[PDB]
């Protein structure tokens, strides 16, 4: 039965890895999210990924497109109170990129302060610069 | 591990409760009166000796071995090429892990042959302590290299240090663990093999000592 590659929500992963791990490869999901979706699907968190049929990971993605609708709570989701519609959302590879750039373009639209350090490209969270972050040349 | 041992009970005054020193033999007489062999079950003395002159002569040998691996290695004189400054993930003062690892190492020695491990240490530290080396003497305002003979105790201590260093050099970021990394040293030292390390340093010291006699 063994396959060595399982493709779920876009990017695949090997079938030789513990199932809680290898899903790490989807940009926007780490460990301490992973065990959650695992335990709310109802499948072992240790099994070697090479043991997955189809309809299971179908459910997996299904949860992956609405964690809150099934028990995953509202204080570990990838953006709570979505500034365009406060709903609870957890995003993935395809669409996080879009979000980061739109939320940059926001402050790029109003000429606030915070944008200036994305534009002029130096730290934003109030370090100093007179000793470190020397990233160019002599 | 297994609880048959995890809890242990001795009624025999030995070392480590597994082996004892009654019949071993050091051949080389220059080292004879300088290797303690009294029972001394617990190899731990709390430095009540390195205060008066020539005090450290009488320690049971396994203790002098166990302390002399509490090392990141060498940190100001290169070894095998690289430096091995490992700091804060060391074993500097943590004698517990030292006792434990040396226990496992002795049991591994006992397996792959089946003999008194400490006698095997006896063969080992007999063949890595050289018997000459060099200095510089002042003769007339001009000073230069010469050669002289090494006193026993220094033979002893250089021997042990080189063994420890060697074994502590085959494990650097290596699948091989530290324990058998020890055994593969005492073994080779007892087999005077060139591929070993402790034998290397005795050979390469005496060579360049006789190169400039």
């Amino acid at each position: 039965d063994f396959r060595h590659i399982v493709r779920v929500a876009g990017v695949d992963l090997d079938g030789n890895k513990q199932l809680r791990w290898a899903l790490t490869a989807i940009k926007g999901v780490g460990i301490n999210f992973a065990t959650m979706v695992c335990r709310v699907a109802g499948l072992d968190p240790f099994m070697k990924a090479g043991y997955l049929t189809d309809e299971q990971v179908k459910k997996i993605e299904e949860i992956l497109q609405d964690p809150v609708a099934h028990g995953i709570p509202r204080w570990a989701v990838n953006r709570p109170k979505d500034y365009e519609t406060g709903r609870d959302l957890h995003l993935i590879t395809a669409k996080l990129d879009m979000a980061i750039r739109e939320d940059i373009m926001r402050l790029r639209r109003i000429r606030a302060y915070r944008g200036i350090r994305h534009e002029l490209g130096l730290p934003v969270r109030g370090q100093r610069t007179r000793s470190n972050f020397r990233r160019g040349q002599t | 591990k297994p609880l048959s041992e995890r809890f242990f009970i001795p009624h025999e005054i030995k070392v480590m409760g597994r082996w004892s020193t009654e019949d071993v033999e050091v051949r080389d007489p220059s080292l004879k009166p300088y290797i303690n062999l009294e029972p001394r079950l617990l190899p731990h003395t709390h430095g009540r000796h390195a205060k008066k002159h020539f005090g450290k002569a009488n320690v049971h040998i396994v203790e002098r071995l166990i302390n002399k691996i509490m090392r990141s290695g060498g940190s100001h004189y290169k070894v095998a090429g690289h430096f091995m400054r490992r700091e804060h993930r060391s074993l500097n003062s943590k004698k517990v892990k030292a006792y434990e690892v040396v226990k496992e190492a002795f049991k591994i020695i006992e397996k792959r042959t089946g003999k008194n491990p400490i006698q095997v240490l006896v063969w080992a530290i007999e063949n890595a302590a050289p018997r000459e080396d060099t200095t510089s003497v002042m003769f007339g305002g001009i000073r230069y290299h010469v050669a002289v003979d090494i006193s026993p105790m220094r033979r002893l201590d250089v021997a042990l240090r080189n063994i420890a260093l060697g074994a502590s050099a085959k494990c650097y970021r290596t699948k091989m663990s530290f324990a058998e990394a020890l055994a593969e040293e005492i073994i080779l030292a007892a087999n005077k093999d060139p591929k070993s390390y402790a034998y290397s340093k005795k050979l390469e010291i005496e060579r360049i000592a006789e190169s400039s006699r």
């Binding site: - | 809890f7 242990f8 009970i9 001795p10 009624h11 005054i13 079950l41 617990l42 004698k95 517990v96």
Partner: protein
Amino acid sequence: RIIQTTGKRKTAIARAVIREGKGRVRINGKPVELVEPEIARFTILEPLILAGEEIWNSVDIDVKVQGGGFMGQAEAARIAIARALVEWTGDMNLKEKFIKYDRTMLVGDPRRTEPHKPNRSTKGPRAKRQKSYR
């Protein structure tokens, strides 16, 4: 009859208790046979292993100790058991063989720690900063 014994090593007091009995010995609730720092479980058996298994067939002993660390309680307890066994039977040879194997099992420990100094003040009297040219 009963006798009571003490000893101190790096701020770890040890009160021993002895009396006639069967051959069991505890510490702070612990039976001796259950001590995970085996390199400690050997730090207190030695006056119980030189005395012979036979004197170790007639005694009830429990110790109360406190202060210091898990390698510091062991030697205070050892001092306890020894200065006890030396009064229970209190003959002379059994002080004899307790001299050859080690000394400070009897003569008491003078080794005491040290202040710190006002140059790093967080390491020790003799580890200063690192000097500065240029």
